[PDB]
Amino acid sequence: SNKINDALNQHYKLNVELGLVYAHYAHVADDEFDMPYLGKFIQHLSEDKLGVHKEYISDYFKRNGMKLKTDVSVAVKSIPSDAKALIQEVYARENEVRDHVKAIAKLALAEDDYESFYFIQWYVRDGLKDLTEVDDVVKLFNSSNDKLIIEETIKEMVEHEIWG
Amino acid sequence: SNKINDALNQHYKLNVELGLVYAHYAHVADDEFDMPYLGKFIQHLSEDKLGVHKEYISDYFKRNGMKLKTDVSVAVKSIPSDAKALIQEVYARENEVRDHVKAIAKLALAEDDYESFYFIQWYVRDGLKDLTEVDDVVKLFNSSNDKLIIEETIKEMVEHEIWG
Amino acid sequence: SNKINDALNQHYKLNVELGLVYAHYAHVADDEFDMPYLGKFIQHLSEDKLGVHKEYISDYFKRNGMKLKTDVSVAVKSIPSDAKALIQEVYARENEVRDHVKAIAKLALAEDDYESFYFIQWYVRDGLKDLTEVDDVVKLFNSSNDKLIIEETIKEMVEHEIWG
Amino acid sequence: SNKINDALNQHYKLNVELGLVYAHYAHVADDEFDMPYLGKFIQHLSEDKLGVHKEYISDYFKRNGMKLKTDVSVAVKSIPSDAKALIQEVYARENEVRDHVKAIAKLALAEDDYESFYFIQWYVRDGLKDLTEVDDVVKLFNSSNDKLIIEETIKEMVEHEIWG
Amino acid sequence: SNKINDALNQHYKLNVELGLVYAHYAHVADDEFDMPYLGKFIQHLSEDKLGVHKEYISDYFKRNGMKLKTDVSVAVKSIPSDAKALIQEVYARENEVRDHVKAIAKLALAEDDYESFYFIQWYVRDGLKDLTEVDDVVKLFNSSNDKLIIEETIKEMVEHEIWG
Amino acid sequence: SNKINDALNQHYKLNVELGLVYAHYAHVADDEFDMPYLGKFIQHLSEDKLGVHKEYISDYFKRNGMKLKTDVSVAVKSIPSDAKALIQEVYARENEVRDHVKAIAKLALAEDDYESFYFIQWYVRDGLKDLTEVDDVVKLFNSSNDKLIIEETIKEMVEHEIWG
Ligand SMILES: [Fe+3]
Ligand SMILES: [Fe+3]
Ligand SMILES: [Fe+3]
Ligand SMILES: [Fe+3]
Ligand SMILES: [Fe+3]
Ligand SMILES: [Fe+3]
Numbered sequence: 014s015n016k017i018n019d020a021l022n023q024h025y026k027l028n029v030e031l032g033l034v035y036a037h038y039a040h041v042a043d044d045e046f047d048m049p050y051l052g053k054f055i056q057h058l059s060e061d062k063l064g065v066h067k068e069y070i071s072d073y074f075k076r077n078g079m080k081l082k083t084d085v086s087v088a089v090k091s092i093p094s095d096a097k098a099l100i101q102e103v104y105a106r107e108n109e110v111r112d113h114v115k116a117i118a119k120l121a122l123a124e125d126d127y128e129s130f131y132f133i134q135w136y137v138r139d140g141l142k143d144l145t146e147v148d149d150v151v152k153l154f155n156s157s158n159d160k161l162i163i164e165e166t167i168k169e170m171v172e173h174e175i176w177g
Numbered sequence: 178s179n180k181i182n183d184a185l186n187q188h189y190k191l192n193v194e195l196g197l198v199y200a201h202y203a204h205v206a207d208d209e210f211d212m213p214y215l216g217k218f219i220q221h222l223s224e225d226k227l228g229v230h231k232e233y234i235s236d237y238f239k240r241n242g243m244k245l246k247t248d249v250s251v252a253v254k255s256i257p258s259d260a261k262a263l264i265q266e267v268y269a270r271e272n273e274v275r276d277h278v279k280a281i282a283k284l285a286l287a288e289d290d291y292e293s294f295y296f297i298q299w300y301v302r303d304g305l306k307d308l309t310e311v312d313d314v315v316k317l318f319n320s321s322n323d324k325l326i327i328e329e330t331i332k333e334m335v336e337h338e339i340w341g
Numbered sequence: 342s343n344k345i346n347d348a349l350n351q352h353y354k355l356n357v358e359l360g361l362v363y364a365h366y367a368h369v370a371d372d373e374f375d376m377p378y379l380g381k382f383i384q385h386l387s388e389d390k391l392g393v394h395k396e397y398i399s400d401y402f403k404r405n406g407m408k409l410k411t412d413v414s415v416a417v418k419s420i421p422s423d424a425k426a427l428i429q430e431v432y433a434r435e436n437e438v439r440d441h442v443k444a445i446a447k448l449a450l451a452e453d454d455y456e457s458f459y460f461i462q463w464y465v466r467d468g469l470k471d472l473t474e475v476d477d478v479v480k481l482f483n484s485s486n487d488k489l490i491i492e493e494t495i496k497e498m499v500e501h502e503i504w505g
Numbered sequence: 506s507n508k509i510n511d512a513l514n515q516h517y518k519l520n521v522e523l524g525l526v527y528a529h530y531a532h533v534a535d536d537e538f539d540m541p542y543l544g545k546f547i548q549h550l551s552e553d554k555l556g557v558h559k560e561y562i563s564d565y566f567k568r569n570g571m572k573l574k575t576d577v578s579v580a581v582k583s584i585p586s587d588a589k590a591l592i593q594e595v596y597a598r599e600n601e602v603r604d605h606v607k608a609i610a611k612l613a614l615a616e617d618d619y620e621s622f623y624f625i626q627w628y629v630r631d632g633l634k635d636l637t638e639v640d641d642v643v644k645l646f647n648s649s650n651d652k653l654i655i656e657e658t659i660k661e662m663v664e665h666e667i668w669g
Numbered sequence: 670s671n672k673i674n675d676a677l678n679q680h681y682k683l684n685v686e687l688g689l690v691y692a693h694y695a696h697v698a699d700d701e702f703d704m705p706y707l708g709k710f711i712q713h714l715s716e717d718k719l720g721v722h723k724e725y726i727s728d729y730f731k732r733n734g735m736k737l738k739t740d741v742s743v744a745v746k747s748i749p750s751d752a753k754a755l756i757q758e759v760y761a762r763e764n765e766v767r768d769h770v771k772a773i774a775k776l777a778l779a780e781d782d783y784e785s786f787y788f789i790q791w792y793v794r795d796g797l798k799d800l801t802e803v804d805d806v807v808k809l810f811n812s813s814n815d816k817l818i819i820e821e822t823i824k825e826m827v828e829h830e831i832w833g
Numbered sequence: 834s835n836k837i838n839d840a841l842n843q844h845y846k847l848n849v850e851l852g853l854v855y856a857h858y859a860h861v862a863d864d865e866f867d868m869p870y871l872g873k874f875i876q877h878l879s880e881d882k883l884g885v886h887k888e889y890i891s892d893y894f895k896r897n898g899m900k901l902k903t904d905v906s907v908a909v910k911s912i913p914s915d916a917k918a919l920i921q922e923v924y925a926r927e928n929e930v931r932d933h934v935k936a937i938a939k940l941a942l943a944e945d946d947y948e949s950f951y952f953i954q955w956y957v958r959d960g961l962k963d964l965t966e967v968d969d970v971v972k973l974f975n976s977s978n979d980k981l982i983i984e985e986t987i988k989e990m991v992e993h994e995i996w997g
Contacts, residue, residue, distance in 0.1 A: 082253075241469070320981050321980060417574075455774045455793050456797055653813045
């Protein structure tokens with residue numbers, strides 16, 4: 014399969030670049046907005062993306078006999094101006110990851126690769142999981158105007174049989 | 178200090194890009210050369226570079242009041258043809274990291290930043306440590322022709338009061 | 342070395358006088374501003390300054406063969422009018438301690454006393470540490486208008502491989 | 506009560522200044538007289554005076570509604586010439602603290618402050634305790650001419666239901 | 670670096686020769702002066718010098734790529750006549766080791782070897798430590814005329830966050 | 834006995850000089866031949882020679898009333914060119930120590946010193962022990978051409994009721 018190889022290479026690319034952008038966003042949150050726990054939350058996301066999400070693709074390429082490609086071009090030229098705008102940007106990125114994974118699953122099923130539809134089930138599920146736990150934090154900025162209350166709730170968040 | 182800020186931004190850049198190149202090299206070693214433990218060794222290096230080596234720079238920039246920049250451009254268009262050539266490439270990269278850190282230390286001392294010379298002592302020491310433990314593996318390919326013996330020695334390597 | 346002796350005597354003087362001023366400020370915070378945990382924080386600072394920060398200078402003078410001098414003149418004739426102004430005063434004092442220590446380090450290196458540059462590394466590092474943990478509390482008074490929320494955060498604060 | 510306020514402010518002043526003088530005397534004992542355990546004894550006295558003896562006065566002023574004043578002027582321009590003369594100086598200072606506390610107790614009883622009498626009982630008792638344990642060490646320099654025997658006895662001292 | 674290589678070779682030489690001279694001095698103290706614990710103290714010094722103080726130089730030469738040289742010429746043709754003279758000789762030797770290490774540190778900094786200034790910091794500190802603990806025993810022979818009291822104190826000596 | 838005194842002084846001399854030569858040989862093995870475990874083996878030999886083998890002679894001289902002499906002149910101007918040649922040199926040195934000890938034992942028995950024949954029995958036995966465990970490693974270089982196999986066997990060696 015060359016179409017599956019191309020799609021999975023693209024997914025690897027996007028995961029690396031999201032990881033780097035999230036690292037920068039966590040620095041900007043902790044430093045410029047005085048919210049260290051929002052920074053720890055975004056940093057947990059960044060480590061998640063730069064770890065197992067590409068570790069698994071490399072392992073699968075070892076097992077099935079496909080080729081790997083590395084091509085990265087990241088740049089951060091503009092940041093949001095609040096913390097609410099920051100977390101809303103994060104939400105949009107996750108929501109786009111969902112559609113990319115859906116396209117991959119459809120492609121895997123259209124060619125009779127049932128081992129590639131089995132692999133992509135993990136990503137199908139983790140997409141909804143991560144989007145849900147990001148919306149959890151998005152919703153707090155609509156419930157309160159006090160930054161310290163929000164930060165205490167996020168601290169408590171930081172420190173399921175189908176999805177979880 | 179703007180010179181110190183620029184030098185540390187460049188060091189951040191180089192660390193990210195070395196991490197990505199090492200990830201690709203570990204895949205190529207394990208997959209194309211049938212040496213999984215050489216791959217685990219290079220992957221340990223990659224995680225080292227992509228973790229604390231830039232985590233510390235971001236923390237220091239939080240503490241002292243400097244600015245961060247993110248600009249990454251990595252590409253892998255050619256690989257070595259043996260495993261000895263691979264590990265020798267790794268050795269050259271580490272040896273260049275040494276000179277970059279030495280230049281930073283000299284610059285920190287030339288301006289009377291004694292908190293930035295205190296900071297860069299850690300990197301001054303870890304450079305020699307990492308270069309030494311990479312030369313340890315470089316030397317095995319000159320001691321034996323049997324790939325399985327080398328791989329057993331590397332497995333045993335995988336699983337000091339001044340440097341260590 | 343007479344220049345090093347004079348510089349270290351001056352540092353001893355300043356440490357004693359900062360300790361006394363911080364004791365008075367902690368009383369004024371707890372009593373006149375109804376913030377007992379801000380008082381506990383400033384009192385921890387005062388004990389820090391009046392303890393090891395001069396204990397170490399006396400020990401070093403025992404070891405290397407220098408002389409000690411005692412000359413103290415402290416007076417508190419005016420206090421701030423809020424708690425934010427109080428903690429900002431504390432921040433300025435710490436920031437001046439930083440420059441004094443930097444001058445001492447430069448002087449130690451200009452004379453070939455490498456045992457006195459080894460000694461002053463501890464102070465070089467503890468300066469940035471203490472300034473950072475004071476700015477942590479400075480920042481809370483810009484995040485909230487409720488005194489009880491701030492006080493709960495400070496209580497939680499009250500009860501690193503390079504700096505910490 | 507303004508007379509009680511003035512008397513307690515003066516006691517705070519004297520305690521701070523005795524603490525500083527005792528710190529200098531301990532340095533001079535251990536450095537210039539080769540008796541490190543006499544130095545540790547005098548340093549224990551200094552920490553005692555600079556700690557709870559003024560901590561309690563600040564706490565009482567918090568509780569009863571009095572004002573605090575800070576005004577310190579210490580200088581050490583002349584030291585004794587033996588170790589016996591040093592410890593005899595220490596004895597005289599303690600004996601004067603006794604009379605100051607006695608005057609405070611009389612004043613508290615002359616005005617019908619029975620909460621200031623209850624407070625000063627602690628100092629009434631600790632005066633005799635500290636004077637007794639200082640005379641214990643004063644007496645050794647009349648029992649022996651050998652400095653090492655005296656130092657061993659003091660080391661053993663370093664490492665009651667009414668007074669103690 | 671050839672100057673650094675030469676300086677470190679000389680330091681290796683001096684350490685070996687001091688170790689041998691201290692072994693002979695410990696024999697002469699225990700046998701000819703009837704002070705076995707002074708002998709144990711000097712023997713501890715000798716083992717210290719003949720162990721890690723040259724073990725570390727050989728390890729560093731393994732790591733950085735320098736050459737080793739061995740050239741030893743020791744002879745003991747005259748000893749002191751008391752035990753005080755013996756320990757004073759020991760004190761002078763340590764005090765000369767201090768100046769040799771200071772010269773090495775200056776040379777390392779004059780050439781931009783910041784890995785050799787990181788290495789020599791250990792010796793910079795251990796010099797003052799060892800000189801202090803030797804002066805501790807030097808001072809006892811001025812406090813007492815009784816050999817058994819001195820010997821008991823030394824026995825008790827035999828059986829810090831900056832220096833220690 | 835003056836003949837016994839002279840013989841034991843010579844044995845002390847030879848032990849010190851063998852210790853120093855073995856230290857240099859261990860450095861040369863680990864550094865120039867890429868065999869760290871052969872280096873650890875030779876270093877263990879060096880530590881034995883520089884420790885108890887002369888500790889016991891000094892103790893015996895304390896007990897029986899003989900005199901000590903210190904006269905050392907070591908130099909290393911030429912090394913072997915393989916690792917087999919290195920270990921064969923080590924073997925010859927041990928074999929010569931055997932004959933020296935045999936001569937001492939004969940001399941002790943020729944004069945009716947039965948306390949010096951009781952003393953030299955220990956050396957008579959340890960000679961054969963050390964020669965045997967050195968020949969164990971000598972024999973491996975005739976069994977294999979692979980350096981890593983030899984090194985694994987030596988590692989396993991590194992980590993009797995009559996001799997042992
Ligand atoms: Fe995830
Ligand atoms: Fe590293
Ligand atoms: Fe501090
Ligand atoms: Fe007391
Ligand atoms: Fe030492
Ligand atoms: Fe032996």
